[PDB]
Amino acid sequence: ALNRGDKVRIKRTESYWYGDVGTVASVEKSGILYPVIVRFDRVNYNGFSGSASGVNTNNFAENELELVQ
């Protein structure tokens, strides 16, 4: 039900942004276990040691998101 621009909180526990806020970029069609693409402002940990930033996008499911605006 979530659309583009939906500010949402991540509930994946193991996620780096669990409790943080991210904006939805797109929702892939049915069939995929994690279609909700969420982009973030704070980069995560990904990258080899000493690298610059990290990854600021990940795919989740509807059940793993709490809706804000």
């Binding site: 780096y16 942004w17 276990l33 994690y34 995560n44 990904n46 080899f48 795919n59």
Partner: protein
């Protein structure tokens, strides 16, 4: 040997297979992501444990995990 598990949070970007230096991983067909594929670990007896597959993984916390187990000549990377 080491265990190399793959989870349903796989997006099938094939980066961990490209990063593997001992051909432990494969890209098998799947239906859980857009790329319609998933990673697999058929040749785990050749895993050394260099964690490169995890380094090349994009998902928020890795979908592929390497757990270091019983050491052998192949896992210790010995040429002697």
């Amino acid at each position: 040997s080491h265990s190399v598990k793959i989870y349903d949070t796989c997006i099938g970007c094939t980066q961990c297979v490209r990063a593997c230096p001992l051909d432990v991983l494969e890209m098998v067909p799947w239906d859980g992501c857009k790329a319609a594929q998933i990673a697999s670990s058929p040749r785990t007896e050749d895993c050394v444990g260099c964690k490169r597959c995890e380094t090349a993984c994009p998902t928020d916390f890795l979908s592929i995990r390497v757990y270091l187990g019983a050491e052998t000549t192949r896992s210790m990377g010995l040429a002697y």
